[PDB]
Amino acid sequence: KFTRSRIPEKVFQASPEDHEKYGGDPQNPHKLHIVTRIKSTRRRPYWEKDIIKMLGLEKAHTPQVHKNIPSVNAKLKVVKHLIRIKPLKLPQGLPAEENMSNTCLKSTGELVVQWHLKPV
Template structure:
């Protein structure tokens, strides 16, 4: 039991030791101190867009937070949802109002939309942008369908119903 209580402190001490020795990895705007020296992060593709939804009321917040919400389009006659680009300027704004909004990365499970797909997309609450592609007609399939409908040897529905009824009534 005592070893479980001490182990978090040991890991914190190791992290502080690596911070004080300067073994950090310099990144844009911060220094990253990995737990283990040979630690490699898995490859990750960041989302290009965010779905930002206001979840707290605007009333009672300072004017600078209200200004950021207004810039993002989360205050006013429009809805409480905005689509925001994943760029450093917007990320800094979102960081300042993170307690007022819910941020969900937008993914494209069926590929990104094209100019033709503008009216046929749907953004789900979990951040999936569903693109309903238009069905393309194939001339050969259309011709085969017409031939099947106009075939004289094919039995139509009315004939099948009559034949089935007669077989039911006179089974022997």
């Protein structure tokens, strides 16, 4: 039969070489994710059609944030093929109450807090 797969836990373990390729380091992990769906739920089974309404990834190529806690992270393990998970990094701090009018995502995942349209 084709059933729901389960992945053995030696693929969600990174070597020290992978931190040379990707930017993340095993000390101080990233607080937030950037998840964006890159495949259709069509021709995928109903469990992989209903996690996508659970994470809110109905409109594809539209990014989304989720916690990097291991309760949400297990849901990303099922629908990993549909999605593109990038870490959320903030160049500045968090946006306070005078800051959230002009923010944007800045692909390469930089939630900048002051978005002017003026050049450098």
